[PDB]
Amino acid sequence: QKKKLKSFTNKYVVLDSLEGLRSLPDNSVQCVVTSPPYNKMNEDDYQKWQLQILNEINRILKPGGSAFYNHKPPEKFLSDSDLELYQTIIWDRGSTVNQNARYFRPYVEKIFWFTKSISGESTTPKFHRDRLPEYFKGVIWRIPPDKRNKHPAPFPAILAEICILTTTEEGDLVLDPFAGSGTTLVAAASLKRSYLGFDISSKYQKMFHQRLATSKSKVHLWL
Amino acid sequence: SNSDSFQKKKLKSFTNKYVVLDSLEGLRSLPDNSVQCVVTSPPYNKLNEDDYQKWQLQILNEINRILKPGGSAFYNHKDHPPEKFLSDSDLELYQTIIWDRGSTVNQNARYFRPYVEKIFWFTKSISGESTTPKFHRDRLPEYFKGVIWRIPPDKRNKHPAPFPAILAEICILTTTEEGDLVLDPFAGSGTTLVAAASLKRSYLGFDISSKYQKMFHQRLATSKSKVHLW
Numbered sequence A: 001q002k003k004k005l006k007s008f009t010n011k012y013v014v015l016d017s018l019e020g021l022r023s024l025p026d027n028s029v030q031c032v033v034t035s036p037p038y039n040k041m042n043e044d045d046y047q048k049w050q051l052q053i054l055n056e057i058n059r060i061l062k063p064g065g066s067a068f069y070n071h072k073p074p075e076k077f078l079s080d081s082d083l084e085l086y087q088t089i090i091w092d093r094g095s096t097v098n099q100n101a102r103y104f105r106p107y108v109e110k111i112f113w114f115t116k117s118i119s120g121e122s123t124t125p126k127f128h129r130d131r132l133p134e135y136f137k138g139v140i141w142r143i144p145p146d147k148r149n150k151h152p153a154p155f156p157a158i159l160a161e162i163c164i165l166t167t168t169e170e171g172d173l174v175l176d177p178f179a180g181s182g183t184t185l186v187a188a189a190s191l192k193r194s195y196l197g198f199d200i201s202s203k204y205q206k207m208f209h210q211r212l213a214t215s216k217s218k219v220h221l222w223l
Numbered sequence B: 001s002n003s004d005s006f007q008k009k010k011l012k013s014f015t016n017k018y019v020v021l022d023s024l025e026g027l028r029s030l031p032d033n034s035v036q037c038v039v040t041s042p043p044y045n046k047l048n049e050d051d052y053q054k055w056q057l058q059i060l061n062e063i064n065r066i067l068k069p070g071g072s073a074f075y076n077h078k079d080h081p082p083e084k085f086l087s088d089s090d091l092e093l094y095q096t097i098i099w100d101r102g103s104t105v106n107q108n109a110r111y112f113r114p115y116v117e118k119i120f121w122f123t124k125s126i127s128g129e130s131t132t133p134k135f136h137r138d139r140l141p142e143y144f145k146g147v148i149w150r151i152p153p154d155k156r157n158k159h160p161a162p163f164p165a166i167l168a169e170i171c172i173l174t175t176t177e178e179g180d181l182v183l184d185p186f187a188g189s190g191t192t193l194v195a196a197a198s199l200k201r202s203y204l205g206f207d208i209s210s211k212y213q214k215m216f217h218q219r220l221a222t223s224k225s226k227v228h229l230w
């Protein structure tokens, strides 16, 4: 595992997410940014599967590490993992095509900010809010969808940038165990952090490899 | 039945009143399917974590009994996560509304600036089946049709921890007709009741504080029935 981590650094690995997490050694990942899929589902089956994912993330996180978990009663089962929920971030997407008038316009997704627990005690995450522009220092992030992304359900690069830049130094490992188009990986690389992704789709691995090749290494966050 | 007769009499006497009474006792005094809209922000403590949640489950279950079918309960949780126990209630969670207060004095840099409180929008469940809330989003300005409400705190309110009248107005106007009963079992300064009266709805509040009851009566007397939405 410790040797295998050297061989996992700056790679997009086509592999089941739980298998990949179990190959990582303890206290080896500084930051996780991810948006899990809907299914690889019965509600009970999905909860425990996501529960194994979160419990593995708690093991692999470094003390002071952070996991940012974008989800579309989720909090009912997320409480049951070894991870400690630290803050719930509100992602305001700006607009929504769902104009159904049975409810208020649902243009918000939650980003759960988890932190590692050692022996049942709550750590405080490494966090540098000063590194962000004022626009993103608050609990509501107004970030519109990234239309140029080829994945069916991605998140924007600047979303991962905010998570990575505030909780890492250069060279730290960033993990996305549901990498998809590789948005988290591209953000980490643009920020001179190391990256690692897991996905079951070799189509999306190829998508990430070509995305890496065809775009200049842009940073969206500003000073 | 004796209980039905007792609750009907209590409802008759309680209507358009701020009643100084324990919240659970007041709720159990109300008839089934008697309330169209609840807007409330519960206190931190009654009058441990396990006791608070057990107590709130009783409150929510009572609210489910007294809501009319298609009725709504708006439940602002001030600020392990509340959703863990809130889902055990007979009430059905329908949507979580994001109240953006605009700013916060807590500038502690250990987290993102926490200027958001949740407003849990519940609907009545009947025999384990969910209802569809009466809801008229067209009555709102475009500013309040989305799941985030930007509403700054009410500066002139004399209560230590109220919510603004326009918050209550949004909940009431979209889920009621004139004459419908609006309930706040934690009335405090009476913000919900003032909003209901300004909108020509019937109101009812419970709170253990005679001081806050007096606060409501004098607030109601010096207000001009202004509608903050309009």
Ligand SMILES: Nc1ncnc2c1ncn2[C@@H]1O[C@H](C[C@@H](N)CC[C@H](N)C(=O)O)[C@@H](O)[C@H]1O
Pocket (backbone or CB within 6 Å): A015, A016, A017, A018, A034, A035, A036, A037, A039, A040, A151, A153, A154, A155, A156, A177, A178, A179, A180, A181, A182, A183, A184, A198, A199, A200, A201, A204
């Ligand atoms: N069992 C599984 N193990 C690993 N990855 C999986 C599994 N099931 C689904 N996935 C992947 O999880 C991803 C979920 C996506 N919504 C992530 C998108 C990503 N945030 C992006 O920007 O592209 C999909 O690309 C799936 O291929």
Ligand SMILES: Nc1ncnc2c1ncn2[C@@H]1O[C@H](C[C@@H](N)CC[C@H](N)C(=O)O)[C@@H](O)[C@H]1O
Pocket (backbone or CB within 6 Å): B021, B022, B023, B024, B040, B041, B042, B043, B045, B046, B047, B159, B161, B162, B163, B164, B185, B186, B187, B188, B189, B190, B191, B192, B206, B207, B208, B209, B212
């Ligand atoms: N057991 C109890 N039964 C009823 N009311 C209670 C009880 N314990 C506390 N309260 C009241 O609950 C209220 C909670 C307030 N934060 C509500 C404020 C209200 N939203 C306003 O705008 O003024 C306080 O006024 C308390 O007096």
